[PDB]
Tab-separated table of C-alpha atoms in Angstrom:
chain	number	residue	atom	x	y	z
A	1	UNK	CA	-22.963	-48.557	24.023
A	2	UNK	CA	-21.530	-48.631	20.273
A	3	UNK	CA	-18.082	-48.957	20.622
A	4	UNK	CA	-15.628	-47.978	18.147
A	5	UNK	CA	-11.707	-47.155	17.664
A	6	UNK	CA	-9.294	-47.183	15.235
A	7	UNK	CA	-6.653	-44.684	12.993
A	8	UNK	CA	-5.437	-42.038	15.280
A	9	UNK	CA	-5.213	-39.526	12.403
A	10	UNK	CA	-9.173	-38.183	12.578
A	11	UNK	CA	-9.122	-39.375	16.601
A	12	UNK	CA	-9.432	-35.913	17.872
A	13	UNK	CA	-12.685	-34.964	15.291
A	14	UNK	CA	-14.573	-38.268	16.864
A	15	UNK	CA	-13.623	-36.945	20.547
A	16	UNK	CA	-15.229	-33.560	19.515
A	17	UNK	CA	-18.657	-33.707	20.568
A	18	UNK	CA	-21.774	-34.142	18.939
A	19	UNK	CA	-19.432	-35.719	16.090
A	20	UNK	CA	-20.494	-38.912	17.146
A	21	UNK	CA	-24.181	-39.101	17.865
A	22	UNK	CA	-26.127	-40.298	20.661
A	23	UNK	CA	-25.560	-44.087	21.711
A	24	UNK	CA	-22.359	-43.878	20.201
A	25	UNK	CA	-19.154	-44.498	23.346
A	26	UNK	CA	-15.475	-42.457	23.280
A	27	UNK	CA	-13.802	-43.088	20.288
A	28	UNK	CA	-10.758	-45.282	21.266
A	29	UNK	CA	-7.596	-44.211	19.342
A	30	UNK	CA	-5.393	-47.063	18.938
A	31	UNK	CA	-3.888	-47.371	15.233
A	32	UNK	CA	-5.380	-48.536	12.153
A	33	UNK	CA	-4.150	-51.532	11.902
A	34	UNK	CA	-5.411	-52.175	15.731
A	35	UNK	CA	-8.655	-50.860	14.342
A	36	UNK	CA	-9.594	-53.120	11.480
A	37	UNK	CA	-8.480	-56.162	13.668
A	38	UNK	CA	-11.126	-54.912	16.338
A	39	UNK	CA	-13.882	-54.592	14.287
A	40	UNK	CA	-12.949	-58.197	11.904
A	41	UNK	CA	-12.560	-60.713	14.467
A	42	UNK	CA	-14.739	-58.476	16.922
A	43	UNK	CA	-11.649	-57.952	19.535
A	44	UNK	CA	-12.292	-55.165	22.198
A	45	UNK	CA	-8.664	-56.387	23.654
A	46	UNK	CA	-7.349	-53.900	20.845
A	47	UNK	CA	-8.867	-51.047	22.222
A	48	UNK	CA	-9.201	-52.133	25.952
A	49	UNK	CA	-9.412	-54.763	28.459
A	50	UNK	CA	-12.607	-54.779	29.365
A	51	UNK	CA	-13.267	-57.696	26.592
A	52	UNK	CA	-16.765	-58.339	27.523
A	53	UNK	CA	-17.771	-55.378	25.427
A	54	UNK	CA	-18.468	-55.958	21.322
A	55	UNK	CA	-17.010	-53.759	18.517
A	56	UNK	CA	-19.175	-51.896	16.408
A	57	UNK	CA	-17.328	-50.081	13.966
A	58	UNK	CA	-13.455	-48.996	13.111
A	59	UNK	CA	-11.904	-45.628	11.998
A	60	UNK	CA	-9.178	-46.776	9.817
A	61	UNK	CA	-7.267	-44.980	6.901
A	62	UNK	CA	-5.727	-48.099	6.074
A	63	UNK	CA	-7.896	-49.937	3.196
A	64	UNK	CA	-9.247	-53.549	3.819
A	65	UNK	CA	-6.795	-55.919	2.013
A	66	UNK	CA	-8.522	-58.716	-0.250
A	67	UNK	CA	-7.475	-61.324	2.624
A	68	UNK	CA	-9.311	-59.350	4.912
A	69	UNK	CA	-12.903	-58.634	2.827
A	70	UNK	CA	-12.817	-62.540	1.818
A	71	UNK	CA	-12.431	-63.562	5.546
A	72	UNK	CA	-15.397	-61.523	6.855
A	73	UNK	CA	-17.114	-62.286	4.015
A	74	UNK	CA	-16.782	-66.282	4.330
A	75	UNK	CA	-16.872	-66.412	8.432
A	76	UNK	CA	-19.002	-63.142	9.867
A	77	UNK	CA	-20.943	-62.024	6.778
A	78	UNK	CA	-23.335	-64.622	6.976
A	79	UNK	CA	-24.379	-64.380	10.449
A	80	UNK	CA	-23.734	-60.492	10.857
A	81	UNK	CA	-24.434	-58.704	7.548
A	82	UNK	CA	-21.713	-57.234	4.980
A	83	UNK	CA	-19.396	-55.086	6.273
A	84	UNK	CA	-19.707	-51.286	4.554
A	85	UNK	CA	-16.620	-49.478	4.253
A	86	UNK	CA	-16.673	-46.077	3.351
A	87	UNK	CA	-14.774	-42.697	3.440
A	88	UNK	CA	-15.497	-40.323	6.485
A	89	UNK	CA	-13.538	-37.253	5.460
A	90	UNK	CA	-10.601	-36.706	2.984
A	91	UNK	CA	-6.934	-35.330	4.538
A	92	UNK	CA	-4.075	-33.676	3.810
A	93	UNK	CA	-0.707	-35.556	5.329
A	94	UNK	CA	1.314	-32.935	6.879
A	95	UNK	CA	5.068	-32.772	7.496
A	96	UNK	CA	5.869	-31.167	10.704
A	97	UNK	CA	9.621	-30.710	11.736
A	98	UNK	CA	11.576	-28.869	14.571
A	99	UNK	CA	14.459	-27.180	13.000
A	100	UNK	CA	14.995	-23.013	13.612
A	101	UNK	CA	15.833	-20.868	10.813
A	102	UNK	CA	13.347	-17.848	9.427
A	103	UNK	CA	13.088	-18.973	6.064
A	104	UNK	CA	10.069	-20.726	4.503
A	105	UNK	CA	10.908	-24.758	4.295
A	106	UNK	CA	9.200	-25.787	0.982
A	107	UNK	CA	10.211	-29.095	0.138
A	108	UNK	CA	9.876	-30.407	-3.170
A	109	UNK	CA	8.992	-33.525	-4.261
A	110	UNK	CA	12.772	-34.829	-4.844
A	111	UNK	CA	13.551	-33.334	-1.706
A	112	UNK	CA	11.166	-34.795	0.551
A	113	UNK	CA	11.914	-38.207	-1.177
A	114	UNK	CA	15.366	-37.814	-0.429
A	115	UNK	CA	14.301	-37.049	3.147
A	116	UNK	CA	12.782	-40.413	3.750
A	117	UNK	CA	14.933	-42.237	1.377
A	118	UNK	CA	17.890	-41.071	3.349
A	119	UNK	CA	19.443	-39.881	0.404
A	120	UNK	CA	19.470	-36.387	1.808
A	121	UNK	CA	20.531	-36.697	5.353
A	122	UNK	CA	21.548	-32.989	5.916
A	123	UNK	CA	19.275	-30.238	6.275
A	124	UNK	CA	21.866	-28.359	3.830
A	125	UNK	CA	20.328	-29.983	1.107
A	126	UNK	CA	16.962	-28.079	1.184
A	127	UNK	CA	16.967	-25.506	-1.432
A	128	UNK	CA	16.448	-22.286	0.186
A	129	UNK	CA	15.442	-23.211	3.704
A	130	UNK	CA	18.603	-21.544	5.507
A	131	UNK	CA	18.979	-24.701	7.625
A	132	UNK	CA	21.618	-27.297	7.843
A	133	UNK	CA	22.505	-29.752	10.064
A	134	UNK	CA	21.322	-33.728	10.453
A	135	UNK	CA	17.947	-34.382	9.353
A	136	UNK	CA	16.564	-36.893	11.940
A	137	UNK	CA	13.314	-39.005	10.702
A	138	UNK	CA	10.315	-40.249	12.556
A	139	UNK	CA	8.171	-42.798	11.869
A	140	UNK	CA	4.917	-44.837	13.101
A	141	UNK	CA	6.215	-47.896	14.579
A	142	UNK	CA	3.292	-49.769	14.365
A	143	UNK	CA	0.271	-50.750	12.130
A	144	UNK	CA	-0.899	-47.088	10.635
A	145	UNK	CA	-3.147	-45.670	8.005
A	146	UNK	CA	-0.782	-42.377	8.209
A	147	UNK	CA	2.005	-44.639	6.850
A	148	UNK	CA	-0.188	-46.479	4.000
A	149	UNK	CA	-1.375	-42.344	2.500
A	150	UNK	CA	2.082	-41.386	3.274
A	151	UNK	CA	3.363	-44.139	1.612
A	152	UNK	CA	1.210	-44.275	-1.190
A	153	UNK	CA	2.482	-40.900	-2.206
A	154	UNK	CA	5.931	-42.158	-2.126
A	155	UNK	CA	5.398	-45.130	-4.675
A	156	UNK	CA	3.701	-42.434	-7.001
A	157	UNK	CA	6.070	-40.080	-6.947
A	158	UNK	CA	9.659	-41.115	-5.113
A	159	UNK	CA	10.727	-42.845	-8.824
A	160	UNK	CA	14.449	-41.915	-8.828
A	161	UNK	CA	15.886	-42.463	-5.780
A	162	UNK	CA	18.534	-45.242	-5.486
A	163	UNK	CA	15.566	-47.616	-4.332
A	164	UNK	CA	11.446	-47.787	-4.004
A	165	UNK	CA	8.794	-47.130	-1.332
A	166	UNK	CA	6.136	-49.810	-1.463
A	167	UNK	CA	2.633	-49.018	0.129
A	168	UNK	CA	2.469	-50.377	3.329
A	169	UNK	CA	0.848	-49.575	7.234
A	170	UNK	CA	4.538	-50.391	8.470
A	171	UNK	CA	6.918	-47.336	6.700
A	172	UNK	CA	10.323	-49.440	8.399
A	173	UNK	CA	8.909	-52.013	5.530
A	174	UNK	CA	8.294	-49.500	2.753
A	175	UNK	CA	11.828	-48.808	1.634
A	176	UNK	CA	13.330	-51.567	-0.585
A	177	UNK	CA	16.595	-50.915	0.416
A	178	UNK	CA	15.388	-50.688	4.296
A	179	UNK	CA	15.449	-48.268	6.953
A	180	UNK	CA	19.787	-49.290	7.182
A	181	UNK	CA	20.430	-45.527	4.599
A	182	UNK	CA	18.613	-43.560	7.712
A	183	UNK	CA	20.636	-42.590	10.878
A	184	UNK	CA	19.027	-42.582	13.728
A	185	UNK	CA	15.615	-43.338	12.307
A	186	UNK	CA	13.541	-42.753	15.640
A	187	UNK	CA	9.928	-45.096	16.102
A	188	UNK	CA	6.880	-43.872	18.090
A	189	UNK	CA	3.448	-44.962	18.422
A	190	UNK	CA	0.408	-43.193	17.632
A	191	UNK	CA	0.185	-39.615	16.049
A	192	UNK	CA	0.291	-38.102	19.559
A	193	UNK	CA	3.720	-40.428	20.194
A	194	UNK	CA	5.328	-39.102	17.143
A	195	UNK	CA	4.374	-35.641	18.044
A	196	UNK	CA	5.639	-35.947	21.142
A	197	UNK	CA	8.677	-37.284	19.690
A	198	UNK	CA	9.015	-34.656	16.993
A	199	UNK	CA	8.528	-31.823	20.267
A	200	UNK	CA	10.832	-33.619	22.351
A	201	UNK	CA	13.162	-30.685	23.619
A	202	UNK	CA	16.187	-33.198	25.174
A	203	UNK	CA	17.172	-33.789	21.936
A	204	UNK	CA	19.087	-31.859	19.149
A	205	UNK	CA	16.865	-30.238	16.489
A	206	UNK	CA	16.814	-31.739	13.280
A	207	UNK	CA	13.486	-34.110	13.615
A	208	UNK	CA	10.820	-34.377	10.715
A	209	UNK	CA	8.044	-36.539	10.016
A	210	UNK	CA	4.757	-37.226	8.230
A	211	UNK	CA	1.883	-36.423	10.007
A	212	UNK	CA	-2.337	-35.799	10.394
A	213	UNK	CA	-2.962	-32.084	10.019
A	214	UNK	CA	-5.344	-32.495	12.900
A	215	UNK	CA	-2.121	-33.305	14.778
A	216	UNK	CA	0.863	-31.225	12.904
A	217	UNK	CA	0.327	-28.108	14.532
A	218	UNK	CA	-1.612	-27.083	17.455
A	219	UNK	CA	-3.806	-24.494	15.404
A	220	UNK	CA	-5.278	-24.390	11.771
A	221	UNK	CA	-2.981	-21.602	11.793
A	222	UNK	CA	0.074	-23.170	12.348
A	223	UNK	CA	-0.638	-25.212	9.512
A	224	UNK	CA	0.614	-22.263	7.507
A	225	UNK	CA	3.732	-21.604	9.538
A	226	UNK	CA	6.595	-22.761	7.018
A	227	UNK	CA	9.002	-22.578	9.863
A	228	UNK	CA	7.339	-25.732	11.506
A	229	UNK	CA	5.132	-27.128	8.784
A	230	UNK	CA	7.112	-27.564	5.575
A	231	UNK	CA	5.323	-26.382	2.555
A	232	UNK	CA	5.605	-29.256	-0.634
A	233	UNK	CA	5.406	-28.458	-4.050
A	234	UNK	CA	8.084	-26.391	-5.340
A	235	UNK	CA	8.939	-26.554	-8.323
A	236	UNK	CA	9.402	-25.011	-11.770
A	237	UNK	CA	6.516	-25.266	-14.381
A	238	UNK	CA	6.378	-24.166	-17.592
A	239	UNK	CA	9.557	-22.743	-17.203
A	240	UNK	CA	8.380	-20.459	-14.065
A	241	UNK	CA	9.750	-21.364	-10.330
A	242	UNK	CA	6.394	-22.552	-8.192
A	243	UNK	CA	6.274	-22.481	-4.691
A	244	UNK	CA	4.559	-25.518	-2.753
A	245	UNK	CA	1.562	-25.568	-0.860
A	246	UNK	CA	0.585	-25.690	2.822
A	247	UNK	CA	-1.256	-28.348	4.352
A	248	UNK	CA	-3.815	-26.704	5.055
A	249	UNK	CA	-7.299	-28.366	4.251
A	250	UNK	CA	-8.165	-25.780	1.486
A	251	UNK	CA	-4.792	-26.408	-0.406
A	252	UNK	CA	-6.615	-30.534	-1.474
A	253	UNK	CA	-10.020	-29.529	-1.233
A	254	UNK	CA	-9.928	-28.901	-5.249
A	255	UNK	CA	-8.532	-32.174	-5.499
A	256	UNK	CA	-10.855	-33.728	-3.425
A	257	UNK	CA	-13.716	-32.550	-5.549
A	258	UNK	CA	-13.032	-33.988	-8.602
A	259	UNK	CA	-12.610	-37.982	-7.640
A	260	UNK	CA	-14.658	-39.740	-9.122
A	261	UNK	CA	-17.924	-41.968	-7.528
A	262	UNK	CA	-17.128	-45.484	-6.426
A	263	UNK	CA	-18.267	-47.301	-9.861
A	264	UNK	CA	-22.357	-47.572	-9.230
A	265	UNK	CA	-22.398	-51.372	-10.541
A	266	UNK	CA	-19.626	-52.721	-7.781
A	267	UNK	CA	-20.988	-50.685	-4.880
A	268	UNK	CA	-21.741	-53.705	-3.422
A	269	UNK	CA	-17.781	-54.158	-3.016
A	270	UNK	CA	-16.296	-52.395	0.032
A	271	UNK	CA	-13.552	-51.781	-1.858
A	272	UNK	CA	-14.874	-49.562	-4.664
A	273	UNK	CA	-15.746	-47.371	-1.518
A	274	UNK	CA	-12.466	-45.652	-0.748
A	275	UNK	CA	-10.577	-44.222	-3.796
A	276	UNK	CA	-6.882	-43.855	-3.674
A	277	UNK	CA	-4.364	-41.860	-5.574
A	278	UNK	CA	-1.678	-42.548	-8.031
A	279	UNK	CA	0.370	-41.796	-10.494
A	280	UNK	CA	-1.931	-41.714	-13.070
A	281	UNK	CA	-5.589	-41.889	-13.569
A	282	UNK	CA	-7.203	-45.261	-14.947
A	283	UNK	CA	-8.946	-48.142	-13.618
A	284	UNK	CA	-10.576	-46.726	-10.401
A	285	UNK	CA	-6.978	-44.810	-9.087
A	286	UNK	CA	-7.218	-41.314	-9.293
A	287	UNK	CA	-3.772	-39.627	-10.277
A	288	UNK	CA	-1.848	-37.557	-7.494
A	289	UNK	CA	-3.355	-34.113	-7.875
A	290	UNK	CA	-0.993	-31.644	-9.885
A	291	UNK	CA	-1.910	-28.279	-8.356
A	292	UNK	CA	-2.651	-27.728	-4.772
A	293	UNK	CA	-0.854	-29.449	-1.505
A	294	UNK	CA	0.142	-32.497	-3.169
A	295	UNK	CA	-0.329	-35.450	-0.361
A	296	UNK	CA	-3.375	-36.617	0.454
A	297	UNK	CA	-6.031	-39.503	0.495
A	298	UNK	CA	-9.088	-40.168	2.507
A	299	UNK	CA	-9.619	-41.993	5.946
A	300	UNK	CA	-12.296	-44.418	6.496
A	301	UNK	CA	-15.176	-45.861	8.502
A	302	UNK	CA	-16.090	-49.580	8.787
A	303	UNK	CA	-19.822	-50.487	9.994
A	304	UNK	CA	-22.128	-53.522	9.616
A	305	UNK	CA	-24.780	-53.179	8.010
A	306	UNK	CA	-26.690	-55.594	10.433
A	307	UNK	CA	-26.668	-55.056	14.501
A	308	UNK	CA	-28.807	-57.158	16.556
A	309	UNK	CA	-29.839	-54.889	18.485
A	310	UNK	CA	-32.778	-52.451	16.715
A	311	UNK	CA	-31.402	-49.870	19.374
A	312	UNK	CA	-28.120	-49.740	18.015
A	313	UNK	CA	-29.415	-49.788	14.140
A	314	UNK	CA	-31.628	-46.416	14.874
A	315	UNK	CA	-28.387	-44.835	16.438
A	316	UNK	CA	-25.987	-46.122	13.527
A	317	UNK	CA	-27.977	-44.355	10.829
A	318	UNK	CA	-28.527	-41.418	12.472
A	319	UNK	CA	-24.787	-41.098	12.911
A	320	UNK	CA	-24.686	-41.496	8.871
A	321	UNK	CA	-27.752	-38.930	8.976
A	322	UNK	CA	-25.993	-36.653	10.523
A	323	UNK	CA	-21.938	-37.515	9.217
A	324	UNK	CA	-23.428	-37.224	5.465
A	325	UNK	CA	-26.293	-35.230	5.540
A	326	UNK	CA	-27.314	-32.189	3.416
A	327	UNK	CA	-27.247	-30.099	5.644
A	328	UNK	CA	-27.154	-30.585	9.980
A	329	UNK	CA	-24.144	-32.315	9.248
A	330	UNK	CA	-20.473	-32.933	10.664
A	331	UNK	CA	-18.851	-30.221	7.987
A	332	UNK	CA	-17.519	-27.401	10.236
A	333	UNK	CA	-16.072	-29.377	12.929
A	334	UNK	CA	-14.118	-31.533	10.153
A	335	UNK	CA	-13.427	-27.782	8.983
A	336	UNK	CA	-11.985	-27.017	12.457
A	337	UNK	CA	-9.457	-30.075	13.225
A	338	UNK	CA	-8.003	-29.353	9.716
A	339	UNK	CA	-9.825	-31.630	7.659
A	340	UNK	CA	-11.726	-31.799	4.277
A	341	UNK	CA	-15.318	-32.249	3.874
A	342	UNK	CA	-16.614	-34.827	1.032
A	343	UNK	CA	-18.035	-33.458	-1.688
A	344	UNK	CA	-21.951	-33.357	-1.666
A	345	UNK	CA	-22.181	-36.168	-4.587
A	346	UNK	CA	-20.372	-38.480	-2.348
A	347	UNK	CA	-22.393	-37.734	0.550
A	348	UNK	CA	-25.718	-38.405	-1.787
A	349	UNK	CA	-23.881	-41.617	-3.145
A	350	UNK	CA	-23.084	-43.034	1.049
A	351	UNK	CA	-27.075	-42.387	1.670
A	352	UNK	CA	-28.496	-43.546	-1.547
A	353	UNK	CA	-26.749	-46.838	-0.771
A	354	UNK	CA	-26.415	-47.033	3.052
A	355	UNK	CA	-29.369	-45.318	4.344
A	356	UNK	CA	-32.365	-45.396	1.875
A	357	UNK	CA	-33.927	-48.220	3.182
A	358	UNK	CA	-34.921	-49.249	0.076
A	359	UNK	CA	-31.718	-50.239	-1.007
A	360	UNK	CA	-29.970	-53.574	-0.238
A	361	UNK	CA	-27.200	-52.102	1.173
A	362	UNK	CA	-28.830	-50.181	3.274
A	363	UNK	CA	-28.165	-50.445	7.667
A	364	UNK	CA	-31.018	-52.166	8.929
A	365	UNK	CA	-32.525	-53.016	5.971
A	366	UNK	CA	-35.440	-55.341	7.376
A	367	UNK	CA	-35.063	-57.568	4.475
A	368	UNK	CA	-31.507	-58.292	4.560
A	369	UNK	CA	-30.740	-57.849	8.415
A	370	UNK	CA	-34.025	-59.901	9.365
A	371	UNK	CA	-32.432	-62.024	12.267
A	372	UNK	CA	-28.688	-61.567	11.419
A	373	UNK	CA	-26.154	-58.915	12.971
A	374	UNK	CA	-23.405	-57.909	14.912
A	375	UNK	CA	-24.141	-58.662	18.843
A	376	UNK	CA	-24.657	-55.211	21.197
């Protein structure tokens, strides 16, 4: 089997099937962080026990740190092929809460700061959502690529609150000034964990959190329910009150559209691969869309370009046949669990490098992967 795991955001599209193409085992959902360790140091014991089995590839919407390319590239590079790290599908990050009241909740971008600054620890203090009452936060505990798009966002755009979010996969670390200005800050692991925490009914309302859209309601349709799923965005511009957006997948897909190709000279450089947002555009970040939902990013899939077994090549790049093909591609399932399609100019730009054989990044390329790879 090829085994892969990883981010729990896009968990439930690889468990779909035919997402995943023939050869290709479960998709283990364990955490980003749990992910990229897997497939680096080739450690099954972060998806399972049974350690006898090899990694093959990570889901992970946390990007591979400069400590982490340089290792691979100095210790399994040589013996395995480069690693290719590229975007699967772009997302939306959602923020799900369980408070009653029939008004829209629209947060806007000083508001939901203030939520997860802990600035704002009352529900009172959301313009026009007809709630009040404490405002309880959840939060990945562990290792997440949730956290580091969440989080992202928040260093963009959180710039007058008493304190700073830095990017991180841990969000109890992103705060300068801590987690301490929270009450009862709750931790859970996994999407599905903070869900569950978010549902829990033995608790007082009040709970809100950052969350995949795949997970944040149980239909596309909820997605839209600003009763459950807060709307962001609101605003006034040019004078004129705005309302925010949903999360839904076609409130970024604009957005999405518009980033720009991984610079054609360095695509040799996992890290070119996955773009991330910003405050402002320049120098490969692309700046926090304007219009639209406003939080979002892309999550990520980490391959070899070398397997040893020619098995397990043939099944890889028909997986990237299908993921970024034209056409008999992955497109309306990533439609259905609430996710964003890439654009067709990033789909040609992840063949033209990674599957023309003729390239020298390409999987399987005879020349480069003659006698190297990872082991089936």
């Amino acid at each position: 089997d090829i085994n892969g795991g990883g981010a729990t955001l896009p968990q439930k599209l690889y468990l779909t099937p035919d997402v995943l193409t023939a050869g290709f085992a479960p998709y283990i959902g364990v955490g980003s962080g749990k992910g990229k360790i897997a497939f680096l140091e080739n450690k099954y014991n972060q998806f399972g026990t049974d350690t006898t089995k090899n990694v093959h590839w990570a889901g992970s919407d946390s990007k591979l740190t400069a400590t982490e390319l340089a290792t691979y590239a100095a210790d399994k590079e040589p013996g395995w092929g480069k690693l290719i790290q590229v975007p699967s599908v772009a997302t939306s990050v959602a923020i799900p809460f369980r408070k009653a009241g029939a008004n829209a909740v629209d947060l806007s971008v000083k508001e939901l700061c203030g939520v997860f600054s802990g600035r704002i620890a009352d529900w009172s203090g959301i313009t026009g959502a007809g709630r009040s009452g404490p405002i309880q936060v959840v939060y990945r505990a562990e290792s997440s690529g949730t956290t580091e798009l969440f989080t992202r966002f928040l260093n963009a755009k959180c710039t007058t609150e008493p304190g700073t979010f830095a990017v991180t996969t841990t969000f109890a670390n992103s705060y300068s000034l801590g987690l301490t200005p929270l009450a009862g800050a709750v931790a859970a692991t996994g999407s599905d964990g903070v869900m569950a925490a978010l549902n829990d009914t033995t608790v007082a309302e009040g709970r809100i959190t950052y969350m995949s859209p795949d997970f944040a309601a149980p239909t596309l349709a909820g997605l839209d329910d600003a009763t459950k799923v807060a709307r962001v965005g609101k605003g006034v511009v040019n004078g004129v009150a705005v309302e925010g957006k949903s999360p839904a997948a076609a409130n970024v897909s604009a957005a999405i559209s518009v980033v720009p190709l991984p610079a054609a000279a360095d695509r040799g450089n996992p890290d070119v691969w996955v773009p991330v947002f910003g405050a402002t555009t320049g120098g490969g970040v692309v700046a926090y869309p304007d219009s639209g939902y406003p939080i979002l990013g892309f999550t990520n899939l980490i391959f070899s370009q070398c397997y040893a077994n020619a098995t397990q090549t043939g099944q890889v790049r028909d997986f990237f046949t299908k993921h970024y093909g034209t056409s008999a591609n992955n497109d309306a399932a990533i439609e259905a669990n609430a996710f964003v399609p890439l654009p067709s100019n990033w789909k040609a730009a992840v063949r033209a490098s990674f599957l023309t054989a003729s390239n020298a990044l390409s999987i399987g390329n005879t020349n480069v992967c003659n006698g190297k790879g990872r082991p089936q």
